[PDB]
Structure 1
Amino acid sequence: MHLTPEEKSAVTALWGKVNVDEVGGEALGRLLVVYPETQRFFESFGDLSTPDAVMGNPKVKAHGKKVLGAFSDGLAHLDNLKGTFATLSELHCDKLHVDPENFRLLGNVLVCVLAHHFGKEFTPPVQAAYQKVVAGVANALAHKYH
């Protein structure tokens, strides 16, 4: 992961203003509404039939916070993404059977949500930096698939 010093600054700077609880909720929620194929992994979450059922679902909000906290771990270890996500990778592969293409969908829904929340502040150069990070996290989540 080729992250220059400026990109890292920009990224980190940015993350420090993120309310993780909420952004996670929104991110996971929009993933299930915009790309309904990813609902097949969460049948135990109950009602997912409309946008309001999804976005306000308490199990969706709790899971989203969980995903985003892990995402948080990654940003604290940008120079060792593979090590940090190694056990999560094996989990998503061996136990959950998630096609890694789904990791890219989520990565991009997150970029959209950061842009939604920060508007102006989310400039092109800042988006470019976050796109490297989400690609990095998706590649690291994918590495132990076998």
Structure 2
Amino acid sequence: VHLTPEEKSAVTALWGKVNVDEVGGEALGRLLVVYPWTQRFFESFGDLSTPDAVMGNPKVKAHGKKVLGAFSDGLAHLDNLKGTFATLSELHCDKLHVDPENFRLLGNVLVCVLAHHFGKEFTPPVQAAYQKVVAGVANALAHKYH
């Protein structure tokens, strides 16, 4: 991605301050809460009936950190999200049947979680760079769909 270096530097720096555990559970929980139809893939997590039920859910929370974990590595390969997510791309496609529109929804949730977290520091320009990242990630993850 057409991340500019001041852009790439901007991403990297905030990212470094991220508690993946927490940001990953928060991101996945908020997705399930704001866009309830995304719950369709997580029936097995249990109870998602309420925002508290969702936010509290340990596996939502454990799947949130694993998803952010994977995201976090892609940030090492910004250069190449595509080859960095190819296998995850096929997986999401061939085994999980996840519509890639979900990746977009998670991306935007993530940006809201980061602003929430970093307030002040998650400036328009830093948001612009992350927007480009989350869009890049969604595209690399959707790339192997067929």
TM-score with structure 2 setting the length:
0.99
Q: Return the offset for 1:48.
A: 0.5
Q: Return the offset for 1:7.
A: 0.1
SS in 2 for 1:40: helix
**Partner of residue 18, structure 2:** 18
CA distance in 1, matches of 2:75, 2:129: 12
Q: Return the offset for 1:26.
A: 0.1
Q: Return the offset for 1:67.
A: 0.2
CA distance in 2, matches of 1:20, 1:101: 23
Q: Return the offset for 1:113.
A: 0.3
Q: Return the offset for 1:76.
A: 0.5
CA distance in 2, matches of 1:97, 1:62: 20
CA distance in 2, matches of 1:138, 1:39: 18
Structure 1 spans left out of the alignment, 5+ residues: none
SS in 2 for 1:85: helix
Q: String of CA shifts for 1:46-71, please: whole Å, max 9, x gaps.
A: 00000110001000110000000000
CA distance in 2, matches of 1:59, 1:11: 28
CA distance in 2, matches of 1:40, 1:69: 22
CA distance in 2, matches of 1:57, 1:97: 23
Q: Return the offset for 1:119.
A: 0.3
**Partner of residue 107, structure 2:** 107
SS in 1 for 2:3: coil
Q: String of CA shifts for 1:21-45, please: whole Å, max 9, x gaps.
A: 1000000000000000000100000
* Structure 1 consecutive aligned stretches of length 4 or more whose deviation exceeds 3 Å: none
Aligned identity (percent) is 99
1:121 is aligned to 2:97:
no
CA distance in 2, matches of 1:37, 1:88: 22
CA distance in 2, matches of 1:23, 1:5: 24
SS in 2 for 1:33: helix
**Partner of residue 69, structure 2:** 69
Measured on the aligned residues, the alpha-carbon RMSD in Å equals 0.4
Between Structure 1 and Structure 2, how many residues are aligned?
146
TM-score with structure 1 setting the length:
0.99
